[PDB]
Amino acid sequence: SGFRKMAFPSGKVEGCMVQVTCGTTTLNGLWLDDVVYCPRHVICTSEDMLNPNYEDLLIRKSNHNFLVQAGNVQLRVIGHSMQNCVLKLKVDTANPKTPKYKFVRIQPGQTFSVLACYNGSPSGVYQCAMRPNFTIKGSFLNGSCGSVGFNIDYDCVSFCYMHHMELPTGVHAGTDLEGNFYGPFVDRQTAQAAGTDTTITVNVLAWLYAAVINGDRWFLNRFTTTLNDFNLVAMKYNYEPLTQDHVDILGPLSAQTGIAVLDMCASLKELLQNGMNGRTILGSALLEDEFTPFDVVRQCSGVTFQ
């Protein structure tokens, strides 16, 4: 029973966090095998954050201009290369704590755990979603760059996010571990801003299913809806379109609870129309959209509380 924002256990990632210093700048790096991955903006100068040319900045660096510290041990940089917006520092020692891992680029709506770090040391762990506008609503202070996001389904760490910068509304932008930004953002000081965000409809539906699994049905109704009429209504509340792929993804939760996906859509339509009238759903007074269908099946019982 119960339902929490639940992160993956962070130990496998903790053993990979290092500190990277270049000049007066320090941030975090990810040490896997004999490579340390970090944001290439570690080599941006303080005097020109507006139009750095990273090829020209990097060719001027020697290996010893990069200080990498793993706990109390200095790691010797023996080569470097840039891939998109990530710097890859080759070090002379492989991380003996490297977990089984892969790099994955995720789609908006997907969730992951974030291990927030400063100076190479972990501060805390929390759950995030890739928003439809390709930002994440993180909790990150100065020097958090190079903190990573990940999932650990079946003992393999899937790294999906590396933190690079903060945007003017206080949300966050970054890259996959190949250095390609999520969204249109760039790793320099610009006027760039997050676009209008929307609600991740398929996740709200997943969380309503979680509420039913955990024994709450008050928000259901006697109605159904077509998929197109649902999207016409939901989009008026700045909800993302629900696709047939999303409907398919919700199939297992629908089967477990006996509530057809389009009947749950009718419930959501009515909740958007009416509000909660002083009630809560899984402890919340708003509709939660940062649990995926996969997340709900991971956390909830396989037996509905009828």
Ligand X SMILES: CC(C)(C)c1ccc(N(C(=O)c2c[nH]cn2)[C@@H](C(=O)NC2CCCCC2)c2cccnc2)cc1
Residues 6+ apart with CB under 8 A from 137: 128, 129, 131, 171, 172
Beta strands in 52-193 (DSSP E): 66-70, 73-75, 77-83, 86-91, 101-103, 111-118, 121-129, 148-151, 157-166, 172-175
Asked whether position 54 contacts Cl ion by CB under 5 A, the answer is yes
The single residue among 58, 67, 106, 125 that binds Cl ion, judged by CB under 5 A, is: 106
Q: Is 80 left (phi over 0), alpha (psi -120 to 50) or beta?
A: beta
Residue 42: partners with Cβ closer than 8 Å, 6 or more residues away: 20, 22, 25, 27, 87, 145, 146
Binding status of residue 124 toward its own copies by CB under 8 A = yes
The angle subtended at Cα 175 by Cα 146 and Cα 15, nearest 5°, is: 35
- Whose Cβ is closer to ligand X: residue 74's or residue 169's? 169
The answer to whether 145 contacts ligand X (rule: CB under 6 A) is yes
Kindly indicate which of the ranges 98-106, 173-181, 200-208, 292-300 contains the residues binding its own copies, using the contact rule CB under 8 A: 292-300
Least Å from the CB of residue 304 to ligand X: 14
Cα–Cα distance measured from residue 166 to residue 154, given in angstroms and rounded to the nearest whole number:
32
Q: In angstroms, rounded to a whole number, what is the distance separating the alpha carbons of residues 188 and 78?
A: 27
* Position 141 contacts ligand X (CB under 6 A): yes
* Residue 41 annotated to the active site: yes
Per CB under 8 A, 156 contacts its own copies: no
Shortest Å distance, C-beta 232 to Na ion: 17
Give the nearest distance from C-beta 189 to its own copies in angstroms: 16
- For residue 165, state whether it binds ligand X (rule: CB under 6 A): yes
- Min CB(270)–its own copies separation in Å: 18
Q: Build a one-symbol-per-residue string for 63-102: x at contacts with its own copies by CB under 8 A, - elsewhere.
A: ----------------------------------------
SS3 state at 29: strand
Hey, CA dihedral for 239, 240, 244, 245, is it positive or negative?
negative
| Catalytic choice (145, 160, 265, 300) | 145
Given a contact cutoff of 8 angstroms between Cβ atoms, the answer to whether 25 and 47 are in contact is no
Residue 138 engages its own copies in binding (rule: CB under 8 A): yes
According to DSSP, the residues that pair with 128 across neighbouring strands are 112
Nearer to Cl ion, 154 or 306 (CB): 154
| 40 CB neighbour count, 10 Å cutoff | 22
Task: Tell me if 44 contacts ligand X by CB under 6 A.
Answer: yes
CB of 90 to Na ion, least distance (A): 11
Q: Could you confirm whether 145 is annotated as catalytic?
A: yes
Q: Is there binding between residue 166 and ligand X (CB under 6 A)?
A: yes
What is the distance of C-alpha 6 from the center of its chain? 13
The H or E element that residue 270 is part of is helix 261-274
Q: Applying CB under 6 A, which residues contact ligand X?
A: 25, 27, 41, 44, 49, 140-145, 165-166, 187-189
Which residues form the interface with its own copies (CB under 8 A)? Answer: 1-12, 14-15, 115-119, 121-128, 137-144, 166, 170-172, 214-215, 280, 283-286, 298-305
